[PDB]
Structure formats: C-alpha cells, structure tokens
Design a protein around this nucleic acid. Structure first.
Lengths: 153, 203, 228, 36, 23, 143, 121, 112
RNA sequence: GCGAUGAUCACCCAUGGGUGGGUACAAAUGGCAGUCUGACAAGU
C-alpha cells in the first residue's frame, strides 16, 4: 500500500507538471517561446508577481538566482556571478563559457523585453509571435558567436 | 406614478400619488422615514435568479441596455394607454421610452428626493420583499462586477502559478523522502535490489 | 512593554513603548497589506503611515469631528491601491462598511485583492464621474472621503453627496493646489474651494493644511445639511 | 545543551560564555595596564 | 512531587516489561 | 581603497535602513488649523477650551485633545531620564544614518567622476575661478 | 485614449531633445530602458524621456508605473530614431533618463522644463 | 523479535500526519481561492477535502445537493444550509476546469 | 496489614493564577538583506 501511495504520488506529480506547463503557456506564452516554462515559473516565483518582474530591470533578471554570490562578491570585491537562475535554460545549457555569459546577457535582456510585453499586453493574441521572433534573434546571435572563433587559423 | 429602482437583491417598483410634487412634499416635510415608506411601501417586485454570472450580466445590461428580466417585470405595468414611470438614468429612460410597451418615463428629474429617501428607508422595505441583509449581497455583486469590468482572463493567475510551482517543489521533496523511507524498509528483503536500482518509481 | 492609549476618536489608538506610534486594530491577523509593521499587545495592532496616507496625518494634525465611526459607513473616492481603505476598514470594524471607488486598472486589481482579504471593503471599479453607473451597488452612505486628483473635485463630491449621502452627512476632502491651480496661493485656493462647497451646500466646519507631512495639501471637514 | 543557546560559531558561544567574558576582560585590563 | 514518584514507579515497571518483552 | 560596487551596495543597504527607520519614526504635526464659524459674536466668545472640551495641555497637544468626559509612562523603569533618552537615541541614529549616507554619496560621485574621465572622450581640462576642476568633452557623436 | 500618455507637440518635443543633447554633452543623461529602470531604482533619475514607435509600447510602458511610484515625471517622443539622434548615437534609443547633479550649469533649463512638464501632466 | 517494523511505523506515522495537515491546508488554500468561506465554515481538513471532492464547483446547489452534502457528515451543525447560502452569495474567484480537476485530484489524494 | 521487583532526596499575592524558562510544529510583504557593468564587439 505504501508503494501504491508512491506511484500515485509520481503519476500525480507528472500530471501536475503537465498542468504547470499548460498554466505557464496560458500566463506568459512568449516567455515559453523564449526561455522555458520551468525557468519562467522559477523567475515568477523568485520575483513574486509578474508586474514586479516587469518592473525589474534586465540585470536583476540576469542575477535573480545567485543573489547570495552577487551581494557577497559585491561586498568583498570579487567577480560578480553571471548566470543566477537562467543557467538552467536549454540555450545557456547549449552554450559554453563566455558564450554562456554573453547569451546570458542577451537572453536576460530579450526576456525582459518580451516579458514586459507579456505582462503589460492588455490585449494579447497568445500566439507566441514576440517570443518566437526574439528567440530567433538569440539563435542568430548564438550562431554568430559560435562561428566567431579564438585560435588563429 | 411608478418608480423603477435597482437593488443588489432585485428590481423594485413603487406606486406614488400623482411624482415631482410628491418628491417636493418629501423633501420639504423630511420624509426619509418609515411613515412615508409605508405610504409608498411596494407596488411590484422581482427577484432575479440565483446565478452569479447571470446577475453579473444583468447588471451589465442595466449599465448599457434593457433586458428580458426587465421585460418579465415590465409585462403588465400599464392599466390604461398612458402610464408614467420615474427613473434616474437618462439613457435607460429613453430606452424604455423606445421599448415596446411605450409607457411614458421621466428621466433624472428632481426625484433624487424619492430615490434617496426610499434608499434611506430601504431597511423598512426589507420586511416587504427581502427578509435578509443586503450587505453581503452587495459585497458579492460588486466583486463580480469588478471582476468582469477588469478583463480577467481566467487562465492567467500569478498567485496560482506560484502556489503550483511551490507545491511541485514540496511534492518532489516528499516523494524523495518517502522514497528513502520505503527503500530502507524494503532493505529488509532486498538490499542488493535497493542498491542496484536508483529510481523511486521503479522501486 | 507597550502601553496602548485610546484616542479621542473611537477606533484609533496610540502605542507608547520604545517608540511613539499612531495605531489601529487589525482585521486580517498577521497580514500586512502594503508593507507596514504590526505590533502584538494580546491584541494585534497595525500602525498608520502619514506620508502614505494623509488621513493619518490629519488626525495627527488635529481634527475636531471625524465622521467615520465603528458603527458607520464611509465612501472612499480615489482609492488608489487601498493603503488607506484598509485602515478605514480597520477603524470601522465589522459593524461599519466602506465602499472604495477607483477607476484605474492596476490599483484596481490591488483593490480587488484587498477586498478579497477584507469584506468591509466593497469594490467599485466604476468611474467616479457618473454615479448612476454604480447607483445599484452603494446605498445611502453616512460619510464620504475624497482623495481624487481631479480639478472638478467639489463638483464630483457634490454629485456623490446629493446622490449617496444621508442628510446631516459628512464630507471630508483632500485638496491639492498644485493639482488644481499650481500658480496661485494655497490660502486663496482653500478659500475658493470652501466657497465652492458653500455653493454646493456643504457647510464647512473646519480645514487643516498638511505642512509637516506633505506640501501644499489641505483636508476639509464639513456637514451635509438640508438635502433630500 | 540548549536551543536558545544553539549558535552557529564556537567563537560566538565563547562570547556567550560569560565567565570567559569576565575572565577575558579582567586579564585584558590587567595586561593592557601592564603594557601602557 | 508525587508526579515524579509516579513517573519513577512507571519507569521501573516499564523497564521490567521491556526486559520480559525482549527476552 | 574601495570601489563603486561595494559603495553602491552600502548605499542601498543604508538607504533601506533609513527607509525602515523613517517608517518607524513619529513626527509631531504643525499646521494652520482653522475653524469656520457662522456668527461674529461666537467668534468673539470663541475659546478653544470650550470648543475642543479639553484642558490646557490637551489643547496644546494637537495629537491628544481628549474630551473631558474621556478624561473622566511609570510602567517602565526610570521614566523621566531613560525613555526619553531611548527615543532621542533612536532619533540620533536615524540622523547618523542620514549623514553617513550623504558622505558616501559624495564618495560615489567623486569616484564616478574619476571613472568617466579615465573612461572616454576627447577632453579639455578647464579650471573654474573658485579653484574647481571640470572637463569639457568635444562635441562628437559616439559610435 | 491610447496607452501613449503624455506625448508632446512639435515645439515642446524639439526643446526637450535639445536638453537631451546638452545633458548628453555634459554627461547628465543615461541611455536605455533597462538603465532607466536602474536609475529609477537608484533614485537619481530626475525625469524620463521615452519613445512611441518601439517594438512595442509595453517594454517602455513598464517605466511610467515606477515613475508614478517614485514621483519622477516622464513624457513620450514620437520617433525613437530622433531620440537616439538627440542621444547622439548610431542606434535608435527608445528610453533615456535625465539624472541629478547640483553643480550643473544647465539646471535652470532642467527646472524650467520641469515646470512646463508638470503643467503638461 | 524484529522491531524495525515498529520503528519505521512510528516514523512513517509521524511523517504521514505532517503530510496530511500540509496537503490538507494546501487543499484549503486551493479551494479558498474559489470559495474562502468554505475554509471559514468547515475547519476539519479531512471533511474539507471530501467536501471539495463533492462540491467541485459552488454553482451546483440543488435540493438533492442539500441531501447528499448533508449525508456528508451531518445536518445538525447547520453546515449544509449555511454553505449553500454562502456558495450562493459567494465572492469567490472562478477558476478553470484544469485547476478544478487538479484541486479535486488533490483532495482525493488527501483522502486516500 | 511497606521496601532492591527499589525506602528517602524563580517571584507575587491565601491548597488558584500572572510573570520567567525549556520542548516539538506551523505562518510572517517580520530582521539578517543590499538586486552587477553599459557603447562598442567581429571580418575586411
């Protein structure tokens, strides 16, 4: 009966994750087109309200996760952390190193723009246009940065 | 004369002795009281039904147009070919002028005396038709009208999504600890299985 | 450790402890609606903030007759984000009822959240300029307060008082010369709006300028006599 | 030991220990008088 | 006082019962 | 020795400390409260004692003007010297937060001045006759 | 009434863009919407100029809210290309922020447009 | 002579009671968003989960609803008539059908 | 009509309460607690 409880918990948690994907696509569809449902809901849970996240600027979104290392390093004069919460996005996962840093910058900035559109669009067609076009922008910047190399040929 | 009145519990219609001169007598003799409301207690009342979305749309049609509840209230108001009725909305006044029963209506005239006094002594009208308190009724109806007047897409709730992701985190933690519990309990029969498999779900 | 002193108005108190504070009771225990701190003395109390709510600065500034009692009903016009309608709900308690009215959208959403928290708040997202649009929702208020930022303030209060106040009612208004004129003296501004209230039949008992807490702000308190 | 005395640093529990505190301040005043 | 006496009494009896239920 | 990052963190720290402190504080009012009287004889006999039905200290204190029918600090130790010292102490700590915040703003402004001067421009150093220093950047669109 | 709240006429817009160039010359203007939000958080933005022709109005409509929060007024320009041209930069800026500095010789000009801007609001 | 069954039974009963009250107050939040006066009317969390499972939505208030929700524990506490009147004049926020199915499955989880 | 299977061993007001303290859990929009930089980068 305990194992029955366990598999019921697992199936209900899977159904809950699907319901969360549906809820995030309903709330902020362009953010689902940009960064991902899970990390978008994580930024929402960090900031509190979506209007508060729209009020937050781009650097706050970039270092929303690692506030501990942020305030620590700014206090004791070290390198500021550069990923925070949005490292777990599939794009920053596909990037590498200072490519991860620059894609973290441009992705935080583009996510701030399209998140402000999603949060302040009184009318909104819920299609995914702004998120798709900004994602194509980040894809083009990523391909350009990957094509730019470092060692001399 | 008739007086059409809107309340959070229903639609109340009053007879008065033939009006403007009745409003004047009210204001000059201070008729905010139970005596005047028993001179004009009730003439024709209608409850609306117990459907929250329906009564919300009903107040929206009160704000904009004329409705079928107003028809089923307004089916037998007239006695002769000419019947007068007092309202406080001008667009609603002309709307029930161009309405089919074509009885003559007065717009927002000096009968703020009438409307304000019967709204003051509306507690005396409560033993007439509405034997309850209308405070929580106005509470719920005002909440519904506000909920519709702001757009309120019912799928976009930030406190719902934040409670949902929090409960997802709690269910993950609870699944992990009950997994460890059943794993150590089933170590009584299978420690080798408990070490060779790692999934809680497969366990 | 913290003595409570009941103020001359029913529903407001003063905390004398390590710091002096102007306080009220609480309706949602352990729920600060806008970030202000709460004290436990036990009975739960929440302090008022004058700069955020000039209504707190007025009773602190000196007020003879405040027409908002526990067993009464108060209309609030210009209820931006509710930081004062929560406090007037606390000062009227369960017996009293406050009708908050606000037109704008996002303070309107904050006000719906606060009306979800507190049943004493009744929400009106309907516009304040046309009272017949929400004449169904509010009935025969005892006192009215205005915090609206529109130049036709005494006129819109005249409409709301004619249509919604009881006779011998209460009219309390916040008036801003920087909003209505912004070029002429505050004293002749206040004299002119007193003359406007006199033309609109409000008999003004008093007025108080809010100099240490805000800048060029006035509150006026008057009776509503001889209206049907 | 306690809960309202369970603190995250052994230096901090040394400052919470008061006999060591007065012992330290006494001997510290002693040796600073010897120094000055 | 006698609460502690009752506690010590029951502690001795529960010790003996733990002994017999163990062996 | 110190940099803009650490002093900006300190700036936000102490500004939020000032905000919490000033939210905690209490300021006595001072306004031109006027009462509007119907008749001139009632003006001539108008007394704040009868109008406010108060006492002398009750009418001098604009906060607590309690009615005489409502009339009809010793709980804490050392009332006359220690509680007032505690209130005034909190007030001085708020003032010292203000002073350290303004001094730190001066530090940050001088550091940003040096940072911009080292950062960028085709500059001309100008001295103003009060012994002061300034830099005139040449008028040019940065690409 | 669109969401495009205060948008000046031609002559007013001209003159604020001229204070924009003079403050960019005296290093009294900061550039970008995210940076404008940053100095709003800083409490040193004295007022805000924004665009109207952006992709879309919303990413800069997030700024008037914090403007009414931190009593720092704002206005709109029709052309963000014109705003970046008065910023003096190759790319069209959509949001720029006039800061505060007490030893600024153009402060009478800024306090003048402050009067005119408050009478517009 | 084995006793870890007793030991893990104590530990699992403690964790189980804790998870009962946590998940049941979470049911209480998730249906107080739709009907907070249910959380003010019925304080028992188990009967709250059962009552959520029965009253999925506060719109279906019938005489047979009075009957079966009174068979739900009782009539004498006034809970049936009071909750029908309060769900008739409720100010609660309407939610979607996916949220509704989620809350009912969560109350069923609490009951099981 | 005993006992090793175990004898015996902080205040105030007069066998009642307040203070003080310790034990486990839950909530906090309670405190620690403060949200990085900003015009150039790459090929020719």
């Amino acid at each position: 009966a305990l194992a029955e409880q366990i598999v019921e918990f697992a199936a209900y948690r899977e159904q809950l994750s699907n319901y969360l994907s549906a809820r995030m696509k309903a709330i902020a569809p362009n953010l689902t087109q940009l960064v991902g449902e899970l990390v978008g809901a994580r930024l929402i849970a960090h900031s509190g309200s979506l209007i508060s996240l729209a009020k937050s600027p781009a650097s706050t979104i970039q270092i929303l996760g690692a506030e501990k290392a942020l305030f620590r390093a700014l206090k004791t004069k070290h390198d500021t952390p550069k990923y925070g919460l949005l490292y777990h996005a599939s794009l920053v996962g596909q990037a590498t190193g200072k490519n991860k840093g620059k894609i973290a910058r441009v992705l935080a900035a583009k996510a701030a723009v399209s998140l402000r559109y999603d949060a302040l669009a009184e009318d909104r067609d819920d299609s995914g246009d702004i998120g798709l076009e900004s994602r194509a922008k980040v894809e083009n910047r990523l391909s350009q940065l990957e094509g730019r190399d470092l060692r001399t040929t | 004369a008739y007086v059409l009145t809107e309340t959070s519990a229903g639609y109340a219609l009053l007879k008065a002795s033939d009006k403007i001169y009745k409003s004047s007598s009210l204001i000059q003799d201070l008729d905010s009281s139970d005596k005047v409301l028993k001179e004009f207690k009730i003439a024709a009342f209608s409850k609306f039904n117990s459907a929250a979305n329906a009564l919300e749309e009903a107040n929206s049609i009160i704000e904009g147009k004329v409705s079928s509840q107003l028809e089923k209230l307004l089916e037998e108001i007239k006695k002769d070919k000419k019947s007068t009725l007092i309202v406080s909305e001008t667009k609603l006044a002309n709307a029930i002028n161009k309405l089919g029963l074509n009885f003559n209506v007065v717009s927002d005239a000096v009968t703020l005396d009438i409307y304000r006094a019967i709204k003051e002594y509306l507690p005396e009208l409560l033993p007439g038709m509405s034997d309850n308190d209308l405070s929580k009724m106005s509470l719920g109806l005002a909440h519904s009208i506000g909920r519709h007047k702001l757009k309120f897409s019912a799928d976009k709730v930030d406190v719902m999504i934040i409670q949902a992701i929090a409960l997802l985190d709690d269910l993950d933690k609870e699944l992990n600890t009950y997994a460890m519990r059943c794993k150590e309990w089933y170590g009584w029969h299978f420690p080798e299985l408990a070490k060779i498999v790692t999934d809680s779900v497969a366990y | 450790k913290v003595v409570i002193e009941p103020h001359r108005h029913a529903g407001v108190y003063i905390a004398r402890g390590k710091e002096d504070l102007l306080v009220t009771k609480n309706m949602a225990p352990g729920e600060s609606v806008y970030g202000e701190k709460r004290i436990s003395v036990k009975v739960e109390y929440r302090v008022w903030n004058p700069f955020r709510s000039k209504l707190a600065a007025g009773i602190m500034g000196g007020l003879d007759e405040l027409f908002i009692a526990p067993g009464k009903k108060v209309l609030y016009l210009g209820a931006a984000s509710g930081t004062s309608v929560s406090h007037v709900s606390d000062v009227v308690g369960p017996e009293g009822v406050v009708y908050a009215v606000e037109f704008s959208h996002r303070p309107g959403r904050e006000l719906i959240s606060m009306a979800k928290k507190r049943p004493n708040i009744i929400p009106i997202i309907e516009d304040a300029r046309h009272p017949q649009k929400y004449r169904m929702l509010i009935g025969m208020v005892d006192c009215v307060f205005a915090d609206v930022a529109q130049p036709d303030q005494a006129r819109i209060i005249a409409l709301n008082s004619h249509m919604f106040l009881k006779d011998q009612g209460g009219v309390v208004i916040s008036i801003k010369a920087n909003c209505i004129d912004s070029t002429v003296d505050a004293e002749t501004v206040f004299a002119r709006e007193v003359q406007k209230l006199r033309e609109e039949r409000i008999k003004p008992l008093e007025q108080l300028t809010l100099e240490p807490y805000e800048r060029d702000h006035c509150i006026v308190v008057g009776r509503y006599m001889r209206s049907g | 030991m306690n809960r309202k005395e369970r603190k995250s640093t052994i230096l901090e529990t040394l400052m919470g220990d008061e006999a060591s505190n007065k012992y330290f301040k006494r001997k510290y005043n002693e040796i600073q008088e010897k120094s000055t | 006082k006698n609460k502690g006496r009752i506690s010590r009494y029951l502690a001795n009896k529960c010790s003996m019962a733990s002994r017999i239920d163990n062996y | 020795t110190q940099d803009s990052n650490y002093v900006r963190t300190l700036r936000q720290i102490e500004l939020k400390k000032l905000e919490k402190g000033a939210k905690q504080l209490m300021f006595k009012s001072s306004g031109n409260h006027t009462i509007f009287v119907d008749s001139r004889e009632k003006m001539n006999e108008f007394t704040p004692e009868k109008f406010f039905n108060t006492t002398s200290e009750m009418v001098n204190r604009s906060e607590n003007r309690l009615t005489k029918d409502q009339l009809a600090n010793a709980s804490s130790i050392m009332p006359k010297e220690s509680l007032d010292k505690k209130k005034l102490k909190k007030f001085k700590q708020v003032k010292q937060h203000l002073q350290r915040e303004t001094q730190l703003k001066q530090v940050q402004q001088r550091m940003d001045a040096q940072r911009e001067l080292l950062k960028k421009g085709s500059k001309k150093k100008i001295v103003d006759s009060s012994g002061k220093i300034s830099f005139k950047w040449k008028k040019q669109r940065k690409r | 009434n669109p969401k495009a709240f205060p948008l000046a006429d031609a002559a007013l817009t001209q003159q604020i863009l001229d204070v924009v160039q003079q403050a960019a010359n005296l290093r009294q203007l900061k550039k970008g919407a995210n940076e404008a939000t940053k100095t709003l958080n800083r409490g040193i933005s004295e007022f805000i100029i924004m665009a109207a022709d952006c992709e879309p109005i919303e990413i800069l409509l997030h700024l008037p809210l914090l403007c009414e929060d931190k009593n720092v007024p704002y206005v709109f320009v029709p052309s963000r290309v014109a705003l970046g041209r008065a910023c003096g930069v190759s790319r069209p800026v959509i949001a720029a922020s006039i800061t505060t500095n007490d030893a600024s010789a153009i402060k009478t000009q800024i306090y003048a447009v402050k009067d005119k801007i408050e009478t517009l609001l | 002579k084995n006793d870890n069954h007793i030991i893990q039974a104590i530990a699992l009963l403690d964790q189980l009671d804790k998870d009962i009250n946590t998940f049941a107050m979470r049911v209480k939040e998730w249906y107080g968003w739709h009907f907070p006066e249910l959380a003010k009317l019925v304080p028992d969390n188990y009967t709250f989960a059962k009552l959520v499972l029965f009253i999925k939505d506060k719109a279906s208030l019938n005489d047979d609803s009075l009957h079966d929700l009174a068979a739900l524990l009782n009539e004498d506490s006034g809970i049936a008539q009071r909750v029908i009147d309060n769900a008739r004049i409720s100010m609660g926020q309407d939610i979607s059908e996916t949220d509704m199915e989620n809350v009912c499955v969560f109350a069923q989880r609490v009951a099981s």
